[PDB]
């Protein structure tokens, strides 16, 4: 019925690892150009 | 250019404004402004320079008279060094859209006095030089940034 199967599990595999290394690497990447914001303050000061 | 210290150098010494805060020259004090002439102006730190037509004897002549204050201690021949400033990238934005213009001032950390690689860096800067309004150059100007500009 699905002759696949096999191949289609092995890289089923393979997906879930590039795909955890790969997420994780850019979740850095979304922070790091982020932080910019995050880290960010600002004030009010009205003239004397 | 303070606001460029204030942060360049923030956290430091170096970021803080010669005229000083509001608070302090509120303040100061007839002793504190004592201390600041006594802790600083000392000596060995001070440099008597002139050019002219005067001779360089009868010069010193007059300060071996005037600037006497001679020292005992070995504290006293000592230049205090000064603890490092540390630069760090960022940016301070003060807006007011209320002012007729902008000012944008951007730098990296300089090498400091003695490098002999401020030479090069002073030959850069003349290549991008400097440009304002007035100038007749024109579009002849040699600096691109003054051409586009
Ligand atoms: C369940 C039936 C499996 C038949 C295929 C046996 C080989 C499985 O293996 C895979 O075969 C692919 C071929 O398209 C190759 O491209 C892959 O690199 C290989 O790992």
Same mark, same amino acid.
């Given at each position: ?12 595999? %393979? ?17 790091? %150009? ?13 003239? %004397? | ?6 942060? *360049? ?6 970021? @803080?404004?010669? !005229? &000083? ?16 002439? =006594? ?9 008597? /320079?002139? /050019? &002219?037509?005067?001779?360089?004897? !009868?010069?010193?002549?007059? *300060? @071996?008279?005037? +600037?006497?204050?001679?020292? +005992?201690?070995?504290? !006293?021949? /000592? ?25 944008? *001032?951007?730098?990296? !950390? ?18 991008? &030089?400097?440009? =304002? ?17």
């Amino acid at each position: 019925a699905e002759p696949e199967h096999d191949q289609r599990k092995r890289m089923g595999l %393979k997906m879930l690892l590039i795909s955890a290394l790969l997420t994780s690497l850019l979740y850095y990447m979304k922070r790091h %150009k982020w932080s910019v914001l995050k880290s960010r303050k600002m004030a009010y000061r009205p003239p %004397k | 250019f303070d606001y460029l210290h204030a942060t *360049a150098f923030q956290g430091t010494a170096l970021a @803080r404004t010669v !005229e &000083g805060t509001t608070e302090n020259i509120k303040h100061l004090t007839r002793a504190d402004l004592a201390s600041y002439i =006594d802790t600083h102006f000392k000596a060995p730190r001070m440099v008597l /320079a002139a /050019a &002219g037509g005067i001779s360089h004897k !009868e010069l010193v002549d007059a *300060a @071996r008279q005037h +600037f006497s204050g001679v020292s +005992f201690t070995y504290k !006293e021949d /000592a230049v205090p060094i000064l603890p490092r400033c540390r630069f760090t990238g960022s940016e301070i934005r003060a807006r007011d859209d209320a002012l007729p213009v902008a000012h944008v *001032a951007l730098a990296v !950390e300089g090498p400091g006095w003695a490098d002999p690689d401020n030479v090069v860096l002073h030959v850069a800067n003349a290549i991008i &030089g400097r440009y =304002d309004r007035t100038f007749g150059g024109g579009k002849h100007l040699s600096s691109r940034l003054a051409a586009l500009a």
